[PDB]
Amino acid sequence: TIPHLAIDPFSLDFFDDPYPDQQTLRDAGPVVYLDKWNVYGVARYAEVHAVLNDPTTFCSSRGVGLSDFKKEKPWRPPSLILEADPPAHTRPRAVLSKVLSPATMKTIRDGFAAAADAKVDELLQRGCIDAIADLAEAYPLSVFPDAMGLKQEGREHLLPYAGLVANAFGPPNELRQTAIERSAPHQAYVNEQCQRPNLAPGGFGACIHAFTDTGEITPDEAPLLVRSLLSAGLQETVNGIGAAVYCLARFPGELQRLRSDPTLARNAFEEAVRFESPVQTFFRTTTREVELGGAVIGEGEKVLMFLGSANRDPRRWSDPDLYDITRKTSGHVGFGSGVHMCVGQLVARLEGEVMLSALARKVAAIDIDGPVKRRFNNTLRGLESLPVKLTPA
């Protein structure tokens, strides 16, 4: 009854151009079985949204990667928020939500915007830049580690550790094996920065350790919660900003609309998150026999959600392949959906908005003038290099 497919969604072939295979996964049926990895898959918006919003059936405490924590050991101690289910997830989630609160965004917005404006001004003096290393990577690295309270030394481990975590969600392929082989130095840095004395006062990390006396988390849980903010978000935001610059370069009429109304910057980044979906996939594990899209999925089965495919499902989106900065983007699953919906989404949207705002006010044209290179990762989609020429307004 359930179509069986041989598509490997974690192959370099798939990463190079996933969109034809994603339609095949969508059009095969609401639920498919991936014989390569022995998991169920949902690629349409409806089923992806349904699975995300049923955490009691499709749990996260057995791992949101391929590995079932009931069968194998996790490569690192489980996340207290990402790899936890309610009610154990609830109170650590509330702490991270208040650490990255709307009030916190108000405290840091003016500084995040000034750094975004300064970066664009600097890049316009060079003209020909790499929109990834010099822009998409350079700007979040200039605001987020400081907002975190991290020391200056050792920040070169942040992006490698981010890519290691994302690769470790994947199947035991070469990308995952090689990432774990290289992991020890990045792992040693991150865990040490999670200790209270190593986090600057007023920053995100210090605020987590200060939240350890309310009955929501204990002092021994704060290091792992700081680890969550060092394991997630940085590369996704970089890939989201890099995809926005790439889209504005290939859809030049959308850059012209953004220039004419810079207040579209926030939705221009939100559309880039849907268009690119920096987090392509996440797993769930069934705690029960469940019926999903006419399929009967047994207990203890892994279910692979195609977030990027759900954001390009023509059953849900009109012209899903087009970058449209005025599209009604509400409802996209680029940040997930439900109780686990990205707790750091306000940080990412703040960084993305103020960067696109600086581009909208200061840049007249963005022209690709070099070979574009894609970075391969078991979980993340993003560009490695994006040579562009910036023309000042």
Ligand X SMILES: COc1ccc(C(=O)O)cc1
Structure tokens given for 6:
């041989």
| Closer residue to ligand X in complex, CB, 32/199 | 199
Spell out, one character per residue from 127 to 146, where the chain touches ligand HEM: x when CB under 6 A holds, - when not.
--------------------
Q: Give me the residue whose beta carbon is nearest to ligand HEM.
A: 344
Q: Using the rule CB under 6 A, give the single segment among 11-19, 171-179, 226-234, 383-391 that binds ligand X.
A: 226-234
**Does residue number 268 form part of the binding site for ligand HEM (CB under 6 A)?**
no
From the list ligand X, Cl ion, ligand HEM, none, pick the one residue 344 interacts with, judged by a Cβ distance below 5 to 8 Å according to partner type: ligand HEM
Please identify which residue in the block is written with the tokens 């849900």.
316
**HSE-CB for 232 with a 13 A CA cutoff:** 22
Q: Closest distance between ligand X and the C-beta of residue 362, in Å?
A: 31
Please give, one letter per residue, the 3-state secondary structure of the chain: CCCEECCCCCCHHHHHCCHHHHHHHHHHCCCEEECCCCEEEECCHHHHHHHHCCCCCEECCCCCCCCCCCCCCCCCCCCCCCCCCCCCCHHHHHHHHHHCCHHHHHHHHHHHHHHHHHHHHHHHHHCEEEHHHHHHCHHHHHHHHHHHCCCCCCHHHHHHHHHHHHHHCCCCCHHHHHHHHCCHHHHHHHHHHCCHHHCCCCCHHHHHHHCCCCCCCCHHHHHHHHHHHHHCCHHHHHHHHHHHHHHHHHCHHHHHHHHHCHHHHHHHHHHHHHHHCCECEEEEEECCCEEECCEEECCCCEEEEEHHHHCCCCCCCCCCCCCCCCCCCCCCCCCCCCCCCCCCHHHHHHHHHHHHHHHHHHEEEEEECCCCEEECCCCECEEEECEEEEEEC
**Does residue number 45 form part of the binding site for ligand HEM (CB under 6 A)?**
no
DSSP label at residue 211: T
From the list ligand HEM, ligand X, Cl ion, none, pick the one residue 335 interacts with, judged by a Cβ distance below 5 to 8 Å according to partner type: ligand HEM
From the list Cl ion, ligand X, ligand HEM, none, pick the one residue 187 interacts with, judged by a Cβ distance below 5 to 8 Å according to partner type: Cl ion
Find the binder of ligand X among 22, 183, 193, 231 (CB under 6 A): 231
Q: How many residues bind ligand HEM (CB under 6 A)?
A: 26
From the list ligand HEM, ligand X, Cl ion, none, pick the one residue 93 interacts with, judged by a Cβ distance below 5 to 8 Å according to partner type: ligand HEM
**Does residue number 81 form part of the binding site for ligand HEM (CB under 6 A)?**
yes
From the list ligand X, Cl ion, ligand HEM, none, pick the one residue 76 interacts with, judged by a Cβ distance below 5 to 8 Å according to partner type: Cl ion
> Is 284 a known ligand-binding residue?
yes
| Closer residue to Cl ion in complex, CB, 187/378 | 187
Spell out, one character per residue from 63 to 92, where the chain touches Cl ion: x when CB under 5 A holds, - when not.
-------------x----------------
Find the binder of Cl ion among 79, 187, 239, 286 (CB under 5 A): 187
Spell out, one character per residue from 146 to 175, where the chain touches ligand X: x when CB under 6 A holds, - when not.
-------------------xx---------
Q: Are 341 and 335 in contact (CB under 8 A)?
A: yes
| Closer residue to ligand X in complex, CB, 357/377 | 377
**Does residue number 335 form part of the binding site for ligand HEM (CB under 6 A)?**
yes
Region label for 331, one of left (φ > 0), alpha (ψ between -120 and 50) or beta (otherwise): left
**Does residue number 232 form part of the binding site for ligand HEM (CB under 6 A)?**
yes
**Does residue number 147 form part of the binding site for ligand HEM (CB under 6 A)?**
no
Residue 2 phi/psi, 5-degree rounding, is -90, 125
Q: Using the rule CB under 6 A, give the single segment among 174-182, 190-198, 278-286, 294-302 that binds ligand HEM.
A: 278-286
Q: Is 209 exposed, middle or buried (0-12, 13-18, 19+ CB in 10 A)?
A: buried
Find the binder of ligand X among 25, 31, 42, 82 (CB under 6 A): 82
Residues that bind ligand HEM (CB under 6 A): 60, 64, 81-82, 93, 228-229, 232-233, 236-237, 240, 273, 278-279, 282, 307, 334-336, 340, 342-344, 347-348
Known binding positions for heme b: 89, 93, 284, 340, 342
Residues that bind ligand X (CB under 6 A): 79, 81-82, 165-166, 228, 231-232, 279
